Amino acid sequence: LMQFTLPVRLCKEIELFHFDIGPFENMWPGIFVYMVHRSCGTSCFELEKLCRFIMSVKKNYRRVPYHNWKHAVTVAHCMYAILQNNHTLFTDLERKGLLIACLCHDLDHRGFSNSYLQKFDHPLAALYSTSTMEQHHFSQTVSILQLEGHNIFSTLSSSEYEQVLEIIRKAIIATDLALYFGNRKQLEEMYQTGSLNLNNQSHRDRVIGLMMTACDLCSVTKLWPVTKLTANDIYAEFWAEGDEMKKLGIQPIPMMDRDKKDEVPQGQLGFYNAVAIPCYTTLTQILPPTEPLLKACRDNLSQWEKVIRGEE
Numbered sequence: 001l002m003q004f005t006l007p008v009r010l011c012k013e014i015e016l017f018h019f020d021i022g023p024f025e026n027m028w029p030g031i032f033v034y035m036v037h038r039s040c041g042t043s044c045f046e047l048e049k050l051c052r053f054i055m056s057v058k059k060n061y062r063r064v065p066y067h068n069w070k071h072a073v074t075v076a077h078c079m080y081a082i083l084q085n086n087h088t089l090f091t092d093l094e095r096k097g098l099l100i101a102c103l104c105h106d107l108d109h110r111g112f113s114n115s116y117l118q119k120f121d122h123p124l125a126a127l128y129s130t131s132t133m134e135q136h137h138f139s140q141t142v143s144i145l146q147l148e149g150h151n152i153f154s155t156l157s158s159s160e161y162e163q164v165l166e167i168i169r170k171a172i173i174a175t176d177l178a179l180y181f182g183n184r185k186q187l188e189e190m191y192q193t194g195s196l197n198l199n200n201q202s203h204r205d206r207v208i209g210l211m212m213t214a215c216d217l218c219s220v221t222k223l224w225p226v227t228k229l230t231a232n233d234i235y236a237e238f239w240a241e242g243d244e245m246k247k248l249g250i251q252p253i254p255m256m257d258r259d260k261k262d263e264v265p266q267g268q269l270g271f272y273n274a275v276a277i278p279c280y281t282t283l284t285q286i287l288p289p290t291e292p293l294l295k296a297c298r299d300n301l302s303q304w305e306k307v308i309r310g311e312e
């Protein structure tokens, strides 16, 4: 049969958590299939259906600075690294579902937060009152799954299919950062009082939720130059939202106000301290082989510290 292969540098470096998928868009589909094949099997999906699914997913990501197709593949690659480093912890349906969930998790994102949609009074905010964009991303996922020749799950039973779509739904909803804080706190408590139990479905769900946050945030776990340049795309979106807030006659939060350009280094610190570090800490506790993510995050926190001290 036809295995996908990668040039030597990619073949080796793709296994590492800090891998960057590179500027050549046309190689991203192949990189994804490669990951599916090794983390799932060459038999997980019909190749022709999978390739058609990938291309429709790509088509449904928009040309925005951060929440775009490169982000989707980047988040899936972080998931691949987690899955490959925790071989025996996950079911076959989870392996299948989670890489798809990652590829799909920001489908049709417009570059605006849930909060902006609510203040704009976008139709999506009436259809979905919480986790607005995330329910939209899951809906887009189902749509694409139902296009002719796009059902990559065709070989699953009605109940297995239902289970995989449920994993995907929950994984996608979990990428709403508003939900992360409470999910991480519960996980922290369960881990510390030793109640955490991976045979408990609602516990697995929470663990997968945290994995999703970890993958979604993985720009903070890259080599410093990647981290730094990604942060520029992040703010390009936020600040455009800031402008749109001012158009509605609302002062945006500092994160989204381009007039606060100078405070960026300090905004990153609070973010690593409040969000990133706690996320990778708890994840490393639950899943020890993901420690390279915490380590990389800590390195990047220290780089933002250097930026503030004027040493960079």
Ligand SMILES: CCc1cnc(C)n2nc(CCc3nc(N4CCCC4)nn3C)nc12
Residues within 6 Å of the ligand: 217, 219, 220, 231, 234, 254, 255, 256, 260, 261, 262, 263, 264, 265, 266, 267, 268, 270, 271
């Ligand atoms: C998707 C959420 C996300 C993911 N990854 C990264 C690296 N970031 N960085 C941010 C912004 C972090 C931030 N910047 C600021 N401001 C900068 C100047 C004034 C205040 N306040 N805060 C909290 N958000 C994310």
Ligand SMILES: [Mg+2]
Residues within 6 Å of the ligand: 105, 106, 133, 175, 176
């Ligand atoms: Mg999102």
Ligand SMILES: [Zn+2]
Residues within 6 Å of the ligand: 071, 075, 105, 106, 175, 216
């Ligand atoms: Zn995302």
